Amino acid sequence: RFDPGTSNRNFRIAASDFGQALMLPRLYATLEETAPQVRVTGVNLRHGPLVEELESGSIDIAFGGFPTLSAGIKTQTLFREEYVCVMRQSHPALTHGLDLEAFRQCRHIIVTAHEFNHVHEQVEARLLELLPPESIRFTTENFLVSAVIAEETDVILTIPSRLARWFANRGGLTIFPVPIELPSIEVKQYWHERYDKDPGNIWLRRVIAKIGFQ
Amino acid sequence: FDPGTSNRNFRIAASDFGQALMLPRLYATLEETAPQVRVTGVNLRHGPLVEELESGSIDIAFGGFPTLSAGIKTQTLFREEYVCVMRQSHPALTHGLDLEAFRQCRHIIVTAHEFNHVHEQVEARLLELLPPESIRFTTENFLVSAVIAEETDVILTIPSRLARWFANRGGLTIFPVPIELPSIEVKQYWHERYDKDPGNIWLRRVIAKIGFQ
């Protein structure tokens, strides 16, 4: 059914834009070394029921936190992620510290995710509860968009640390801890039972599961 | 409608590139004159944009959408060209990017077909001229693909503003693309139903006043 060295299969992985940008580069080596005509497509999250897409075969694997996925779904946990805060290094509060109430008074960009039933909705909910409505300036579905915007303007962004670190590395942004206690996230890969024994699917899970996510 | 005291959440539909470009150019106007106004960036979807503009679901669309015509007003904001980027630590760098070398590289392609975005044209041209095995990754977000090109040895063909944005802050280097590609017109789009809506009108005018480099 599936041979890495000769396959032309195009694998589709559903993930947030962040999850995509995290995953695919970690697959490149394996692809050039052992599967040089295999393709990986990063598919955005949708409003429709994700379990259906895994069932129909239109998605091979989902990657991230999808608490709503259960029946007929098999999973494996890959790592934990924690949230932090960022603001750009030419931000007025940077010269200052930031306790909880100064935090509440700044401008925020929120990444929204409840429509996609992605675990980040947990954080989103916490922030919408905490923050004065007037404190929220921008809203977007994409983590990477939100990061770029935080670099170009004075808004505070609350995001997975891995993403924060990737953008900190260019010095646009400073990382500081969230002044509230946010849930720790379990990031996994998800697939459907109907494909548990599919050779290609099995191969992909193996590769993903061997990724050094440290 | 008063900007100074409104709390309206305006929804703009654009590619992730379009959102990243637009919203920052709106911050000052918000800070100075509409401090309670929210802007939301919405991803392009499966369905037809017109039905979203009509619905009120989306206030304005930003980008290049040839398909919007019947009941849509537009104002052209600027025009964009395409280039290639590869990271400085790429073998093909110190060698030139002629068409024959191009074909021998691995590519990441941004796909746009689903949401009738002008990039369809660019995507189609590349697929025409590239062997199916030089294509390694595919994604629908420009920003995703730009960080992937920064992390791995893939070639990425993208709009120059996006390119210039990543070249400055990192390892990607910009190359002309040895493939014939259309120029692009970036417009704002809105339904005629809201042509006269004060809120909309205000937004459209703030945008038409942005100085896109």
Author numbering:
A (entry chain A): 89 to 302
B (entry chain B): 90 to 302
Sentences from the paper on this structure:
Purified recombinant PcpR protein, which covered the substrate-binding domain (residues from 85 to the C-terminus of PcpR), was crystallized in the R3 space group with 4 molecules per asymmetric unit and solved at 2.7, 2.2 and 1.9 Å resolution for the apo-form, PCP and 2,4,6-TCP binary complexes, respectively. Although 4 molecules were seen in the asymmetric unit, PcpR appears to exist as dimers in solution as illustrated by multi-angle light scattering (MALS) consistent with weak interaction between the two dimers in the crystal lattice. To further analyze the biological relevance of the oligomeric state of PcpR observed in the crystal lattice, the apo-form coordinates were uploaded to the Protein Interfaces, Surfaces, and Assemblies server (PISA). The results of PISA analysis gave average buried surface area of 1985.3 Å2 and ΔG of dimer formation to be −10.1 kcal/mol. Examination of another interface, could establish a potential tetramer, gave an average buried surface area of 254.1 Å2, ΔG of interface formation to be −0.25 kcal/mol, and CSS of 0. Overall PISA results suggested the observed dimer to be biologically relevant, but not for tetramer. Thus, the observed tetrameric nature in the asymmetric unit is likely due to crystal packing forces. A water molecule was located in all apo-form and complex structures of PcpR, forming a hydrogen bond with the backbone amide nitrogen of S104. Despite the close proximity of the PCP-binding sites in PcpR, there were no significant conformational changes of the backbone, or the dimer orientations upon comparing the apo-form to either the PCP or 2,4,6-TCP complex structures. Comparison of PcpR with BenM and DntR indicates that both our apo-form and inducer bound structures of PcpR are in the closed conformation, which could be due to a crystal packing forces.
PcpR and TcpR belong to the LysR transcriptional regulator (LTTR) and are responsible for controlling the degradation of PCP and 2,4,6-TCP, respectively, although their precise mechanism of transcriptional control is not well defined. In general, the LysR family transcription factors consist of an N-terminal DNA-binding domain (DBD) and a C-terminal inducer-binding domain (IBD). The monomeric structure of the PcpR inducer-binding domain contains two nucleotide-binding (or Rossmann fold) motifs connected by a hinge region. The PcpR dimer was established by interactions between β-strands and α-helices from each monomer.
